[PDB]
């Protein structure tokens, strides 16, 4: 993928945002911004130029499943890649996220190798 691709990393725990931002840097992606919940994320997205979203699920103000649905229903951003990264591991959560249009789903805790693999699977799927 394009190394200037602009990522938004969304999680209510700063620890996890830091993990994801550092992983992306190792992968050659330095154009990375953070948000603390779905509302904060939507505000950043509206400012424009984003090419990829990585999002938690459990967050105050707007949770990540609502964020994913909001993105998919909006004409300006409906095709935006969205990778879910969450501690929810039950099949019904995976199904609800997949059906709502998630590009990929990673269960926490995850390894560096798993994140890289799942990002690449999405790049290949979308011809990026
Ligand atoms: F809080 Be997340 F869904 F891991
Ligand atoms: Mn959370």
Swiss-Prot record:
Alphabetized CDD domains for the sequence: REC_CheY_CheY3
Residues recorded as bearing 4-aspartylphosphate in the entry: 56
Cofactor(s) named in the record: Mg(2+)
Keywords: Acetylation, Chemotaxis, Cytoplasm, Flagellar rotation, Magnesium, Metal-binding, Phosphoprotein, Two-component regulatory system
GO MF annotations, alphabetized: metal ion binding
Coiled coil: none
Post-translational modification: Phosphorylated by CheA or acetylated by acetyl-CoA synthetase, depending on which acetate metabolism pathway is available.
Subcellular location per the Swiss-Prot or TrEMBL entry: Cytoplasm
Cofactor binding remark: Binds 1 Mg(2+) ion per subunit.
Residues recorded as bearing N6-acetyllysine in the entry: 91, 108
Role summary: Involved in the transmission of sensory signals from the chemoreceptors to the flagellar motors. In its active (phosphorylated or acetylated) form, CheY exhibits enhanced binding to a switch component, FliM, at the flagellar motor which induces a change from counterclockwise to clockwise flagellar rotation.
Name of the protein in question: Chemotaxis protein CheY
Native source organism of the sequence: Escherichia coli O157:H7
